[PDB]
Amino acid sequence: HTFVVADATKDMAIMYASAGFYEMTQYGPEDVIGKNCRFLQGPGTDTEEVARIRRAIKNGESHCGRLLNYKKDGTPFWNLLTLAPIKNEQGAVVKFIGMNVEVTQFTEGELEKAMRP
Amino acid sequence: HTFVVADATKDMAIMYASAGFYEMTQYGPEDVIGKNCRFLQGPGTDTEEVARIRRAIKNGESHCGRLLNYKKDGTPFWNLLTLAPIKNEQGAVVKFIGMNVEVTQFTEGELEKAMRP
Ligand SMILES: Cc1cc2nc3c(=O)[nH]c(=O)nc-3n(C[C@H](O)[C@H](O)[C@H](O)COP(=O)(O)O)c2cc1C
Ligand SMILES: Cc1cc2nc3c(=O)[nH]c(=O)nc-3n(C[C@H](O)[C@H](O)[C@H](O)COP(=O)(O)O)c2cc1C
Structure with missing residues (x-):
């Protein structure tokens, strides 16, 4: 679990982040709770992917x-961000969940372990 | 594990698919091994997302x-497709892995179970 929950009734502020998120990004709760996650963006982040989001x-x-994002120390990393709406019974959006995957090189080795009968 | 492996030295033909893939899509190995996964696409599939891929x-x-995809019975489903290159030591791409997630509604209930201290 690397994910965050954003509150649609407080302008998509982060209301919760998993332990994995703090560790991936190096930021602590003081930098995250109550904020918008756009703060991870930086030089070179793709404007059109941001607009799709x-x-x-x-x-x-x-x-x-x-999306290109940046850790607290300024290290750039690729983030495969998936997003899903959370609706109430009225069918209205009250939260979003976001799941953040830090891209690493997938090796022939890792593939063998994935495919091994 | 829902994923497939494609062989870059045979024009991105699928060389392997996980059990999850057959079950998600309803297709069997006879419809998948040796094929290109574009066969899941259909009416309404977004041309520009396909071009990004x-x-x-x-x-x-x-x-x-x-991406919108279709099961063997013609049911449409949303597929969050993530893709990663597999390189050899020369740094050349020899395979791709693709991981397919079937979007379902995320409920306030599921979120509580995800967030529950
Ligand atoms: C639940 C959730 C998680 C998000 N996680 C990230 C993230 O990890 N990295 C990022 O760059 N943007 C992330 N975003 C996107 C930004 O919060 C923002 O929505 C995006 O930059 C587009 O809006 P803007 O054009 O006002 O910045 C997330 C958004 C939501 C709703
Ligand atoms: C490993 C891998 C998995 C893929 N899985 C899917 C998939 O599940 N659904 C899909 O519509 N396209 C999938 N594709 C994309 C198509 O195979 C194809 O690359 C895409 O439609 C763009 O090429 P085209 O414009 O020639 O069709 C996958 C591709 C790769 C390499």
Whole structure:
């Protein structure tokens, strides 16, 4: 579990983050709770992927996209961000969940372990 | 594990698929091994997301995107497809892995179970 929960009734502020998120990004709760996760973005982050994200959230749609993000120490990393709306019984969006995967090289070795009969 | 492995030295033909893939899509190995996974696409599949996928594969890049796909019975489903290149020691791309997530509604209930201290 690397994920965060954002509150649609407080302008998509992060209301919760998993332990994995703090460890992946190196930021602590003081930098995250109550904030918008756009703070991870930085030089080179793709403007059009960011716009796709924004639209998906506005439309209440699930989404995924690779985005460049930055750790607290300024290390760039690729983040496969998937997003899903959480609705109430009225069918209104009250939260979003986001799941963050830090891309690493997938090796022939790891594939063998994945495929091994 | 829902994933498939494609062989870059046989034009991205699927060389392996996990049990989860057969069950998610309802297709059997006879419809999958040796094929290109584009066969899951259909009416309404987003042309530009498909083009993003194509470019990522050509550039040897990791990627994610939501795509409409179809099960064997013709049921449409949203597929959060993530892709990652597998390189040899020369640094050349010899395979791709693809991981397929079938989007379902995420409920306030599921979130409570995810967040529950
Ligand atoms: C639940 C959730 C998680 C998010 N996680 C990230 C993330 O890890 N990295 C990131 O760059 N953007 C993330 N975002 C996206 C930003 O919060 C923001 O929605 C995006 O940059 C587009 O809006 P903007 O154009 O106002 O910045 C997340 C959004 C949501 C709703
Ligand atoms: C490993 C791997 C897995 C893929 N899985 C899917 C999938 O589940 N659904 C899909 O619609 N496309 C999938 N694709 C994408 C298609 O195979 C194809 O690359 C895409 O449609 C773009 O190429 P085209 O424009 O020639 O169709 C996958 C590709 C790779 C390499």
